[PDB]
Structures are given as structure tokens and as C-alpha cells.
Amino acid sequence: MLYLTQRLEIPAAATASVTLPIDVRVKSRVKVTLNDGRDAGLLLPRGLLLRGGDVLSNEEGTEFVQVIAADEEVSVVRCDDPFMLAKACYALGNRHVPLQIMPGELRYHHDHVLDDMLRQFGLTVTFGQLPFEPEAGA
């Protein structure tokens, strides 16, 4: 069984990739399946947040697996008004909602209640199956 025990500070050329959602990327010990079909097990130190692009390796340094953020069901807030987005960020932060903040776009796990609340600010909230990279800190 392939065990990925560390995240390289300096990545090496990937030999495989693994596409995982945020809930798995914050776990230290769990079974996963690589993009190529192979089984593998995460056996990392605690307190890590694996980000898309990170490269994990096995003890022997013969396997280098590139982590990729999986598509997740998210609410999307695309808006060219930075002021309105800032208001949305405050509202979402006040409710402790994990949030991905990008210039002109916000993403969070789909939630109808939060969507309608943001819509009252005049924001257009849509839906998508997209990678989710929430801001550091939970």
C-alpha cells in the first residue's frame, strides 16, 4: 500500500495526482484513490491544510502525488463591485462561513439561506461544481 507521509516544502515532478475536496484535505489519516486508479493512504502530521498544487511523497521518495482541489457544490458570487463583495465578506465572516475570496468572485459551500441573505444586498448568487479553496483558518 502506498502511504503518503509528507508534504514537500520543495515539490518534485509529480508521478501522479489526487483530486480531493476540502473536508479530506484537512484530514491526516484517510484512504484516497489517485487519478490513475491506484489506492493510497494519507498518513500526514496533524494540523495541515493541503492546497491544490501541493505535492505529497512517500517515505522512500519514489512517489510524488500532486494534490488537486476537487469540484464541490458551491454558491458563487461574481460581482464587479468590490464594495458589495466586501459587505458580503463581512456578513459571511460574521456567520463563520468558510469562504474563498478572489478578486471579483466569492465561493462558499452551497447554502440557500446564505444565498438569499446576500441577494438582499443586491448581489447575484449562482451555483457551480467548482474547486473550493477557503481562506486560511477555520
Q: How was this structure determined?
A: X-ray
| Helices and strands of the chain, counted as H and E runs | 3, 11
The residue extents of the domains of the chain are 1-71, 72-138
Looking from the CA of 118 toward its CB, the CA atoms found within 13 Å total: 31
CATH number of 1-71: 2.60.260.20
The CATH class of 72-138 is alpha beta
Supply 3's cell numbers. 502511504
Task: For residue 24, give every residue at least 6 positions away whose Cβ sits within 8 Å of its Cβ, in sequence order, or none.
Answer: 30, 32, 42
Supply 74's cell numbers. 458551491
In the numeric block, the cell 460574521 is attached to 94
Q: What is the resolution of this structure in A?
A: 1.5
Q: Is 112 annotated as a binding residue?
A: yes
Strands 16-20 and 6-7: unpaired
Number of Cβ within 10 Å of residue 53's Cβ equals 12
Supply 27's cell numbers. 484530514
Q: Is 110 annotated as a binding residue?
A: yes
- Do the beta carbons of residue 41 and residue 59 sit within 8 Å? no
- Do the beta carbons of residue 8 and residue 51 sit within 8 Å? no
- Do the beta carbons of residue 53 and residue 17 sit within 8 Å? no
Strands 6-7 and 125-131: unpaired
